[PDB]
PDB file of C-alpha atoms in Angstrom:
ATOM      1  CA  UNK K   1      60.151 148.353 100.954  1.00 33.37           C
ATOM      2  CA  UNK K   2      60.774 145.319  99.220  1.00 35.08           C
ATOM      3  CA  UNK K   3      64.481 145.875  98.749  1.00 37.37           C
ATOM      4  CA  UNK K   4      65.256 146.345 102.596  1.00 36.92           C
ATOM      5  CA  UNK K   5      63.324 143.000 103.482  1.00 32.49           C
ATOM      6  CA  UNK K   6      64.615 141.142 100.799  1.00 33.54           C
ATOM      7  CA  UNK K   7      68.196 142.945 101.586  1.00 32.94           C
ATOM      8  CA  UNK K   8      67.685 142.318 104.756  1.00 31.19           C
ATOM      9  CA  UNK K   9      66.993 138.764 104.819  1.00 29.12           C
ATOM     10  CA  UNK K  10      69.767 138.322 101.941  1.00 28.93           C
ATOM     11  CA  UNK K  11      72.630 140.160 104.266  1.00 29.55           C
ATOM     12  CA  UNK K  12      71.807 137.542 106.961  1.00 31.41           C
ATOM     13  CA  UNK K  13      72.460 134.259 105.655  1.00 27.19           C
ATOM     14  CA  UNK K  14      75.234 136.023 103.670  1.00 27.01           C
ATOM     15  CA  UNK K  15      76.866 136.637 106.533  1.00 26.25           C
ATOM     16  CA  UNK K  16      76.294 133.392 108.580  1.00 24.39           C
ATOM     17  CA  UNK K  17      76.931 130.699 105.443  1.00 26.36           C
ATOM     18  CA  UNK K  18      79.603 132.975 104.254  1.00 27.38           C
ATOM     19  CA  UNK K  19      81.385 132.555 107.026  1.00 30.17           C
ATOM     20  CA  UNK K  20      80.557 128.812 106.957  1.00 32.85           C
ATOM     21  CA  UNK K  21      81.937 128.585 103.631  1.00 31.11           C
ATOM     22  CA  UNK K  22      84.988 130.006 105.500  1.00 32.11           C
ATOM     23  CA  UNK K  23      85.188 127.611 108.025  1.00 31.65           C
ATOM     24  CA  UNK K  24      84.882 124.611 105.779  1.00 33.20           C
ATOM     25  CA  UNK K  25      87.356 126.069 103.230  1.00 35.84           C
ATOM     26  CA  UNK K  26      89.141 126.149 106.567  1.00 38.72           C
ATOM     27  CA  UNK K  27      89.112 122.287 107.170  1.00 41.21           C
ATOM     28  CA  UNK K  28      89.814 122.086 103.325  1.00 41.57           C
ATOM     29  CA  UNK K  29      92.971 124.178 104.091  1.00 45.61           C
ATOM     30  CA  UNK K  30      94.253 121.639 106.205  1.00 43.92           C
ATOM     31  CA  UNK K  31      93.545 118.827 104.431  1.00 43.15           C
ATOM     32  CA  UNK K  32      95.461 120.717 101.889  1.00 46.40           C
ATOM     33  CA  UNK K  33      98.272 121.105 104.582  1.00 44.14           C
ATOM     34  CA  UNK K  34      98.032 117.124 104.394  1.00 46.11           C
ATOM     35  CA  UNK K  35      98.113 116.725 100.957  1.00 44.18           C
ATOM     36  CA  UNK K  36     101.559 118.860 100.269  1.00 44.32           C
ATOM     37  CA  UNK K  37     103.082 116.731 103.372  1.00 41.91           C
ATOM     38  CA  UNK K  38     102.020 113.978 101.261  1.00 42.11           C
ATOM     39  CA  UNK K  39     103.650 115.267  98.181  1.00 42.15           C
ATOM     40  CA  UNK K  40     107.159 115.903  99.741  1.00 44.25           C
ATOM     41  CA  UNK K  41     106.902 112.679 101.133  1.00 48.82           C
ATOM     42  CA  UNK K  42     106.607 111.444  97.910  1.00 48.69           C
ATOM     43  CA  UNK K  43     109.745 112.587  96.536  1.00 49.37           C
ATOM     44  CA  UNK K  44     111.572 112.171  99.159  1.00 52.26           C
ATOM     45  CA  UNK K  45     110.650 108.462  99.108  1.00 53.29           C
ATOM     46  CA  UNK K  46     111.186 108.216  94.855  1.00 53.49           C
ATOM     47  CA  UNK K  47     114.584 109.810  96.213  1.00 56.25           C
ATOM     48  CA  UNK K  48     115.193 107.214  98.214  1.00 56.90           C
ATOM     49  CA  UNK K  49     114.249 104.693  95.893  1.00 59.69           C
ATOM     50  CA  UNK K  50     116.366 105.862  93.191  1.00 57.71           C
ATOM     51  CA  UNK K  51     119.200 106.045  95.738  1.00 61.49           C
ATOM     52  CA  UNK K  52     118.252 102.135  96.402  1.00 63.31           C
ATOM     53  CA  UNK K  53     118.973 101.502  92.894  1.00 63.47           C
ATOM     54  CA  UNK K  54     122.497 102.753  92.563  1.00 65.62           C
ATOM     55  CA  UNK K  55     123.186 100.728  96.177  1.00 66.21           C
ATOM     56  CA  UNK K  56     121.918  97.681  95.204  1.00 71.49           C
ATOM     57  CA  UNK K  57     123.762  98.134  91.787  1.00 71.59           C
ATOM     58  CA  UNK K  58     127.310  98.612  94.145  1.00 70.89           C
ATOM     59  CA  UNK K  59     126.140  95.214  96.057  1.00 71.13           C
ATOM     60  CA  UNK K  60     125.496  93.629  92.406  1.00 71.87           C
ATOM     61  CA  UNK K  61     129.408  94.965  91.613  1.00 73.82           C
ATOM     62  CA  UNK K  62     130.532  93.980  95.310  1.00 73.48           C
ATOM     63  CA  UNK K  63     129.111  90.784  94.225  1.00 73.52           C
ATOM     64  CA  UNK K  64     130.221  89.933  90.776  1.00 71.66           C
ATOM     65  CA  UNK K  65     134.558  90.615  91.356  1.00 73.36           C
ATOM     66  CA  UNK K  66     134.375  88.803  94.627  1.00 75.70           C
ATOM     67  CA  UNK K  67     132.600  85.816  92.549  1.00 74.32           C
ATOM     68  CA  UNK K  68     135.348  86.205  90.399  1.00 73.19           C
ATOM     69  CA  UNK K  69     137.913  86.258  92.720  1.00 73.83           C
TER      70      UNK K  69
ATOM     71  CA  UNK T   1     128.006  90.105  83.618  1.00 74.74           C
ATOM     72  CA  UNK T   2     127.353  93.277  84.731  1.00 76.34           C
ATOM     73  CA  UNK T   3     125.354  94.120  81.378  1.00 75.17           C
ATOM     74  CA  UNK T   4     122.704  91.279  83.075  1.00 75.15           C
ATOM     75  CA  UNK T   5     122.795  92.410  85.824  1.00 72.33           C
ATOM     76  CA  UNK T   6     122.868  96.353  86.070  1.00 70.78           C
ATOM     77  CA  UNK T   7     119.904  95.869  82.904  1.00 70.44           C
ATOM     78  CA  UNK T   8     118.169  94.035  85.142  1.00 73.36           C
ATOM     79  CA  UNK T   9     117.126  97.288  87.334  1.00 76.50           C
ATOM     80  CA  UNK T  10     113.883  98.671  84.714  1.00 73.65           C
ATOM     81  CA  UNK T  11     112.482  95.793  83.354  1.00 74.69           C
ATOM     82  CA  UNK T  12     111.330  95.096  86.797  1.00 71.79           C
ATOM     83  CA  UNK T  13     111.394  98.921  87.697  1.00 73.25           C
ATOM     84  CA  UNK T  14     108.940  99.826  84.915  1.00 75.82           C
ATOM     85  CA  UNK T  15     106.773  96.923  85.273  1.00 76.58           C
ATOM     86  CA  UNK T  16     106.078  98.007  88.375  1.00 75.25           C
ATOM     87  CA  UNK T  17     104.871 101.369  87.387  1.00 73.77           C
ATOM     88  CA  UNK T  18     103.376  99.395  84.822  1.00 73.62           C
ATOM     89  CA  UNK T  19     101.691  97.454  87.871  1.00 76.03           C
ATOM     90  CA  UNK T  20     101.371 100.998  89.239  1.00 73.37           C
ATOM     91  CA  UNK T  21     100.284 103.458  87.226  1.00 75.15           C
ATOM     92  CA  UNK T  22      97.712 101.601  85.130  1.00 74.85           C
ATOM     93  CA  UNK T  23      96.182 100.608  88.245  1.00 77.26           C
ATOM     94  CA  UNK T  24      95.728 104.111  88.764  1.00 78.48           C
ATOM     95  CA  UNK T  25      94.542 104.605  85.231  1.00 76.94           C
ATOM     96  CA  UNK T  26      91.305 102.329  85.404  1.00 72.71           C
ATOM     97  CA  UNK T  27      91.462 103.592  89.249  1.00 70.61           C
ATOM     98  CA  UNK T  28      91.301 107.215  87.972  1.00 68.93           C
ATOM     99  CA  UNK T  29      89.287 106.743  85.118  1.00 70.63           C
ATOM    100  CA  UNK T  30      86.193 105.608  86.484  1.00 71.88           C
ATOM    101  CA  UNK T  31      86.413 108.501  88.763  1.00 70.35           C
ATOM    102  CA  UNK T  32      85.369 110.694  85.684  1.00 73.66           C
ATOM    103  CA  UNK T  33      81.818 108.486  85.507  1.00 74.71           C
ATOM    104  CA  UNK T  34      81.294 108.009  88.908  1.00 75.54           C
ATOM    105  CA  UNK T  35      81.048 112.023  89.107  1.00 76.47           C
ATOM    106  CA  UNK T  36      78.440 111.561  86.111  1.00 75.55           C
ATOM    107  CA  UNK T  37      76.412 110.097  88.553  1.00 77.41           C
ATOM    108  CA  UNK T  38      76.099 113.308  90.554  1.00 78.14           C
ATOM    109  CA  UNK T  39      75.936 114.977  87.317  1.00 78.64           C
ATOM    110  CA  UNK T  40      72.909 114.136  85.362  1.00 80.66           C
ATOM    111  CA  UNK T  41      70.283 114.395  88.412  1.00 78.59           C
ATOM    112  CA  UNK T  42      71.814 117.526  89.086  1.00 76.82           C
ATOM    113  CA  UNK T  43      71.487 117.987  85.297  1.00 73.62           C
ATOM    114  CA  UNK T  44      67.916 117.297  85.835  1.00 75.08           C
ATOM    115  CA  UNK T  45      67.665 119.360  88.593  1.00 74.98           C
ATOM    116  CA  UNK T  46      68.972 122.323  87.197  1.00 75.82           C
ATOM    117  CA  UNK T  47      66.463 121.561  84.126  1.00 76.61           C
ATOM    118  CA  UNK T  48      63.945 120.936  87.018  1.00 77.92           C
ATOM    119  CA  UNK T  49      63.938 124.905  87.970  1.00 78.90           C
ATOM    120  CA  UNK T  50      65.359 126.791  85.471  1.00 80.26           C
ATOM    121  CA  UNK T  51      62.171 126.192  83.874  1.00 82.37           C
ATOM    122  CA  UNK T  52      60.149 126.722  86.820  1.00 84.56           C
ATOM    123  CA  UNK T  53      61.729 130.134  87.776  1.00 79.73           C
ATOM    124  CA  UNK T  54      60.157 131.534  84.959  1.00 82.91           C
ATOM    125  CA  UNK T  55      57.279 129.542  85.798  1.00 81.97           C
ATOM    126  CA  UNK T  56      57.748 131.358  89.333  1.00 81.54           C
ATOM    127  CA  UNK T  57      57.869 134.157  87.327  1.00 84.34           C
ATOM    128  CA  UNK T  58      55.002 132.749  85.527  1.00 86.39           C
ATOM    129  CA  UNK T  59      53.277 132.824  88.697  1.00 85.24           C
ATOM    130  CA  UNK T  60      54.683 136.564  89.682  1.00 86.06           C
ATOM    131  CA  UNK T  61      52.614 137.163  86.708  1.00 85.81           C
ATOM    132  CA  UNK T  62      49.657 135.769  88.922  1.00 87.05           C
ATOM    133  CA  UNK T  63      49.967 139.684  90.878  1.00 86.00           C
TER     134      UNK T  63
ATOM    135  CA  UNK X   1     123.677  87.100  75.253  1.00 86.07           C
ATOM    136  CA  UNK X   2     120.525  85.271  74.999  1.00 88.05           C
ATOM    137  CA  UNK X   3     119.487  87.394  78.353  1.00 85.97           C
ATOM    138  CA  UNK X   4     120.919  90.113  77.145  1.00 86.42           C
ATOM    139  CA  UNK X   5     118.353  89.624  74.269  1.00 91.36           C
ATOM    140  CA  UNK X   6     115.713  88.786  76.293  1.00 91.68           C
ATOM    141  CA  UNK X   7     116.356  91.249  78.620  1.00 91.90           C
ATOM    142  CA  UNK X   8     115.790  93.899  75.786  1.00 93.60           C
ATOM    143  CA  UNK X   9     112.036  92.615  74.914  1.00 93.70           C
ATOM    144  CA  UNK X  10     110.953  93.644  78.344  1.00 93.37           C
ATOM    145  CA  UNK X  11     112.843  97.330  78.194  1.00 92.77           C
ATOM    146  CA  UNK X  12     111.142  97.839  74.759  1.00 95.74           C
ATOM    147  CA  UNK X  13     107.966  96.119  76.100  1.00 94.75           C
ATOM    148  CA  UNK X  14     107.296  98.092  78.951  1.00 89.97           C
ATOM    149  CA  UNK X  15     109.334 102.003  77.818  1.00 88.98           C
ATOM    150  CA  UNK X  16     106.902 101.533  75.312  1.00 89.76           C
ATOM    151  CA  UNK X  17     103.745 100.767  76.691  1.00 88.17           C
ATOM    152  CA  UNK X  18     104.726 103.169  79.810  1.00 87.92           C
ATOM    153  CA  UNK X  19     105.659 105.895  77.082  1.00 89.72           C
ATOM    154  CA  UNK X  20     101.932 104.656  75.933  1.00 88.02           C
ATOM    155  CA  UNK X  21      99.537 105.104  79.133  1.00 86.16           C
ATOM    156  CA  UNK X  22     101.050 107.969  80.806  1.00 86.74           C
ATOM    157  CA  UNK X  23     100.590 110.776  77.987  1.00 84.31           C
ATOM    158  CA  UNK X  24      96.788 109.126  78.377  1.00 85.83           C
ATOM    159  CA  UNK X  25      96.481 109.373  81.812  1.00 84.48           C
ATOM    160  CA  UNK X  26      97.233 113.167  82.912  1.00 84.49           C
ATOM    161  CA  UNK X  27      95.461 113.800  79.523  1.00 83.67           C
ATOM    162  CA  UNK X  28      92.394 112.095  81.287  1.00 82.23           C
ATOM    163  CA  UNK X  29      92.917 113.940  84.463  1.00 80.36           C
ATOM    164  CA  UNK X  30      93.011 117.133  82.503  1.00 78.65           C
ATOM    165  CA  UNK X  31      89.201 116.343  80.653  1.00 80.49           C
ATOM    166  CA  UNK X  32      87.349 115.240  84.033  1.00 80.29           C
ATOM    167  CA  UNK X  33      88.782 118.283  85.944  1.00 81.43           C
ATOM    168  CA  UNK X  34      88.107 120.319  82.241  1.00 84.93           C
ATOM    169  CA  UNK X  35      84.847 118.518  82.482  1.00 83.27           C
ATOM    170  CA  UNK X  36      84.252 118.897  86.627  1.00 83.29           C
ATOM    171  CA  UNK X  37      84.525 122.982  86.962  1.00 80.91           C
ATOM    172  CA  UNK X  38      81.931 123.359  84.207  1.00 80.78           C
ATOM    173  CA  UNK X  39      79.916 121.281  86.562  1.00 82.47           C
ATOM    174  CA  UNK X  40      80.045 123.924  89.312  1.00 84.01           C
ATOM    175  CA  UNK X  41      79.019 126.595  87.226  1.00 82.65           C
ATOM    176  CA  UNK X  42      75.570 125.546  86.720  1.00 82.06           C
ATOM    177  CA  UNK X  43      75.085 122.832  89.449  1.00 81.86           C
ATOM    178  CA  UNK X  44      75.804 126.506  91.700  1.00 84.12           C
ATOM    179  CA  UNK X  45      73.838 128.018  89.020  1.00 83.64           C
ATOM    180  CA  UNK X  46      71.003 126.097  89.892  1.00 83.12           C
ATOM    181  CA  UNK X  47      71.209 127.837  93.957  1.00 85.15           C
ATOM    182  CA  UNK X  48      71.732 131.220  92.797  1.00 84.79           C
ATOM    183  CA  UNK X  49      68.724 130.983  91.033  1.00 83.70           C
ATOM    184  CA  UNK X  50      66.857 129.718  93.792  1.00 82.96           C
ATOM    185  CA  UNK X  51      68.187 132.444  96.133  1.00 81.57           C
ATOM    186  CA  UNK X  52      66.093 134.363  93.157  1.00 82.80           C
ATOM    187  CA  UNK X  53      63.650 132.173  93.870  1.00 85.26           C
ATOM    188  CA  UNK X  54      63.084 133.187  97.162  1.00 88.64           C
ATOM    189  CA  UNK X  55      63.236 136.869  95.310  1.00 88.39           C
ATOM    190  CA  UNK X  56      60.143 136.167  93.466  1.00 90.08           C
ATOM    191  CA  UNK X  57      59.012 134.212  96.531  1.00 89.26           C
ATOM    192  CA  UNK X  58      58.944 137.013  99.189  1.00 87.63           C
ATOM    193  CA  UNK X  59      58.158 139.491  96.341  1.00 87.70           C
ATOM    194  CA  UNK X  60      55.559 136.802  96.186  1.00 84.75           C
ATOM    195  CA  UNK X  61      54.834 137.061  99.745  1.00 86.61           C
ATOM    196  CA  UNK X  62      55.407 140.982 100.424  1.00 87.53           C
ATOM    197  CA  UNK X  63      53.736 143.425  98.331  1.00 85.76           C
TER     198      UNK X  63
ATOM    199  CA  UNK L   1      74.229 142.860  98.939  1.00 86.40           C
ATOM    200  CA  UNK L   2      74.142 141.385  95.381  1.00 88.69           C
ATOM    201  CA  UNK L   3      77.560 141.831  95.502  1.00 88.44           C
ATOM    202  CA  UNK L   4      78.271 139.829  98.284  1.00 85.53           C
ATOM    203  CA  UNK L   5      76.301 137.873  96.836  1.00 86.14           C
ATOM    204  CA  UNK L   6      78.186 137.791  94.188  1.00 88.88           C
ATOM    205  CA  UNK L   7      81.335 137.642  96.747  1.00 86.77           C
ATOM    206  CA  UNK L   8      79.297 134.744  98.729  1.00 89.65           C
ATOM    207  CA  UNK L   9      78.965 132.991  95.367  1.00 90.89           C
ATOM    208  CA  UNK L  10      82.439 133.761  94.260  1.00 89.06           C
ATOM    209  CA  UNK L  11      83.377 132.150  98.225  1.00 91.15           C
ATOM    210  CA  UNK L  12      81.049 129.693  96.989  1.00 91.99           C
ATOM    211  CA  UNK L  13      82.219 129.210  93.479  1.00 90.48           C
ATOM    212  CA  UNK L  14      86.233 129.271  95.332  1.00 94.34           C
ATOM    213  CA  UNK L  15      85.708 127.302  97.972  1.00 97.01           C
ATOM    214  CA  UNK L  16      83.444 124.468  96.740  1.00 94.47           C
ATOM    215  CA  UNK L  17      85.625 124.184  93.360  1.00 92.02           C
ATOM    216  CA  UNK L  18      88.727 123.876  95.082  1.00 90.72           C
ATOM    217  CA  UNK L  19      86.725 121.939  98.085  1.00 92.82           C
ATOM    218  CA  UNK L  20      86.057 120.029  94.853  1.00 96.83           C
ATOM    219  CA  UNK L  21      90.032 119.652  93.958  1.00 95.62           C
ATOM    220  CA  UNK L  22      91.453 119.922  97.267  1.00 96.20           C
ATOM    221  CA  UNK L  23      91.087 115.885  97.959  1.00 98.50           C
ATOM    222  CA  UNK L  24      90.836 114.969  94.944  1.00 98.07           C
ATOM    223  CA  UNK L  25      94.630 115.577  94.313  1.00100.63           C
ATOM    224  CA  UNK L  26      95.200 115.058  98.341  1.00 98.99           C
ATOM    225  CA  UNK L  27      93.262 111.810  97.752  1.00 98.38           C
ATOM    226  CA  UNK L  28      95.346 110.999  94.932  1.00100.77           C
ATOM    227  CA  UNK L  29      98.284 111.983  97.347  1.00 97.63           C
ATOM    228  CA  UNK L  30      96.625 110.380 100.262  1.00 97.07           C
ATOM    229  CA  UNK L  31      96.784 107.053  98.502  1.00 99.72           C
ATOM    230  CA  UNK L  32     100.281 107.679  96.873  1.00102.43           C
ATOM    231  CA  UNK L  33     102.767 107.534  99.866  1.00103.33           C
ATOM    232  CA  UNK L  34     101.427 103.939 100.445  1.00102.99           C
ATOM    233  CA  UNK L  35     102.792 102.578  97.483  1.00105.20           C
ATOM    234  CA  UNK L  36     106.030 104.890  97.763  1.00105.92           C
ATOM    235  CA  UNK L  37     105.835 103.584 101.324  1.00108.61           C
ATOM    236  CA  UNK L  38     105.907 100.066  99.960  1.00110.06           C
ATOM    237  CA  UNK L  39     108.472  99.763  97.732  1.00111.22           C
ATOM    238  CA  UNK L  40     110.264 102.311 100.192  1.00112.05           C
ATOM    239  CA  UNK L  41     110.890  98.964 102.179  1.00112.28           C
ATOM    240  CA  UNK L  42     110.416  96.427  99.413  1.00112.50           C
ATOM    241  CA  UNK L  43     113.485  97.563  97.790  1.00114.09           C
ATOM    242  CA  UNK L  44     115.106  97.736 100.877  1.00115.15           C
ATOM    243  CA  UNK L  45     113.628  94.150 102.137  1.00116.06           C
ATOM    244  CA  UNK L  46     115.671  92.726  98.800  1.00116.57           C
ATOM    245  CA  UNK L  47     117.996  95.059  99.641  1.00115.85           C
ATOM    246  CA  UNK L  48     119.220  92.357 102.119  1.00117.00           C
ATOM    247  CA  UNK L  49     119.579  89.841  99.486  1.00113.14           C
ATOM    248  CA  UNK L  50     121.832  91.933  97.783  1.00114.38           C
ATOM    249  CA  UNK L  51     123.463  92.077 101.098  1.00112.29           C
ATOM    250  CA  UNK L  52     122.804  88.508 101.945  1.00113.23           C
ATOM    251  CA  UNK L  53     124.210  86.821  98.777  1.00114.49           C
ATOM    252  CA  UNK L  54     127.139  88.866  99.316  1.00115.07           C
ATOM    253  CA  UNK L  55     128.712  87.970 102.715  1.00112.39           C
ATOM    254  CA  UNK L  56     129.391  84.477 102.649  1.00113.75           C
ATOM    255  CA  UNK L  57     130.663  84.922  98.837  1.00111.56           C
ATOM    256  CA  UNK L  58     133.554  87.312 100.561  1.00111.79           C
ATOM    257  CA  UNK L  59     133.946  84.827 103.540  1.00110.06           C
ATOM    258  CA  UNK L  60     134.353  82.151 100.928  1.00112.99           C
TER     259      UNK L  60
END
């Protein structure tokens, strides 16, 4: 008796909010998708930026021997 | 004069992430307390009926 | 020379101090998150009970 | 049943947790490209002074 109506009633809103909690992991799976296109950004850019350094170093060289000269 | 120069790259490099990342570090820390704000209500609230369950089955004695 | 001196407070000023906050800050993002999945356990805790509470509640009702 | 309410709860103990960590890291990554995105140009924007002070020194 009390196990199928409590069952019962426990099976339903498993189901439904379950699949909620799907749906909203969902949305969280895309923010994740976000996030990692975030991240490789983010090297790419420090890649960049170390790549910056050793340019601006050549300019400083570039510089420096033409002052001299 | 290239020792000046070519040492001149960290010193304003890692200031910056000194700029940077301690920013982050008073920017991340109070992160940690504001969660304690959601924390101790909940704390509460998790005090508030873990008692009361056996109080519910306090009043399942009441049958 | 003098700058390449005083260049070498800054590069000892700031390795330093950035070889101080960093080993801090991941450390701090390791307690909170540490800290924050306890926080799940029970603050979930807390429902799951509940859903028992409705257990009690229509055994309460039923019967 | 209990199970799946277990599995509901272990849904909810997954998803929430890592709902819980998902932004949290994005967020740290949502505001990190910014200040990558910055200096991404900053250093290039004095870039050009390296470039700058160097032309008319070679003209000269």
């Amino acid at each position: 008796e009390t196990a199928t109506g409590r069952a019962d009633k426990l099976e339903e809103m498993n189901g439904q909010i379950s699949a909620r909690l799907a749906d909203s992991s969902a949305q969280q799976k895309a923010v994740e998708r976000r996030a990692g296109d975030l991240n490789v950004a983010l090297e790419r850019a420090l890649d960049r930026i170390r790549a910056l350094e050793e340019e601006a170093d050549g300019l400083r060289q570039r510089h420096a021997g033409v002052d001299t000269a | 004069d290239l020792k000046v120069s070519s040492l001149d790259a960290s010193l304003r490099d890692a200031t910056a992430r000194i700029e940077h990342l301690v920013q982050d570090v008073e920017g991340l820390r109070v992160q940690a307390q504001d969660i304690d704000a959601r924390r101790g209500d909940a704390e509460a609230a998790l005090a508030r009926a873990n008692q009361d369950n056996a109080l519910l089955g306090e009043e399942a004695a009441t049958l």
